[PDB]
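pipeline/complex-builder :: batch 7 item 3
reading input block
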Amino acid sequence: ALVEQVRGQLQKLERKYLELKSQKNLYLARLKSAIAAQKIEEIAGNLDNASASSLF
Amino acid sequence: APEDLLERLLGEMELELIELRRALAQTIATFKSTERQRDAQQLIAQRWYEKAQAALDRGNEQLAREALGQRQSYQSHTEALGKSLGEQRALVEQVRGQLQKLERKYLELKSQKNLYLARLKSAIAAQKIEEIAGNLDNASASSLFERIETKILELEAERELLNPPPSPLDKKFEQWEEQQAVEATLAAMKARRS
């Protein structure tokens, strides 16, 4: 019984481990997308925004 | 950590087992020596007895009379040793039974030593992994998704603030105007060809 039940834990646990890994990159990619997009519009706001446009 | 004690305690037991193991031979060693002396003493009397056969022979009784008197001194010693040999037998027999029984128990405990150690390690390894998952995935305070995804909204919320979305006003005007742009332009399309 011990060897059977313990294997079930290992069998179930391994499936979960890779499942988390799949979402690891998915959320990381989304974070980077916003991070990259966060600054560019800030530069445009600091560059073009008619209020205090450094450009024009 | 009690686990190291389990291995260490048996090691100390093993030293005592060999210590007792050597001790038993010492008891056996003296037992053999006692047996030899009894055999030697009877031989001395046996030589006197074997000699006494000739001493009594030819009618020279007086020589035999004195000879047997000397024998009795050895006979008394012989009897005492024989009694000692018999009682020593019980001690060697019973002590071996203890050793015979004790050794069987020793290995029996060793069999369960690894069995419980293995189960402990299994739970120990499995104990932490789910704790990480609880600290990682658990929707309450998931470090993986909930806390990370909250930061996503923070950046998302800023874009509308820094770039105010056009009011819903303009959407309908362009859509209202867009249909005329296509229709008015297409009105010429259907008209120019027709």
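note: The interface with chain B takes residues 2, 6, 9, 13, 16, 20, 23-24, 27, 30-31, 34-35, 37-38, 41-42, 45 of chain A (CB under 8 Å).
queue -> next item
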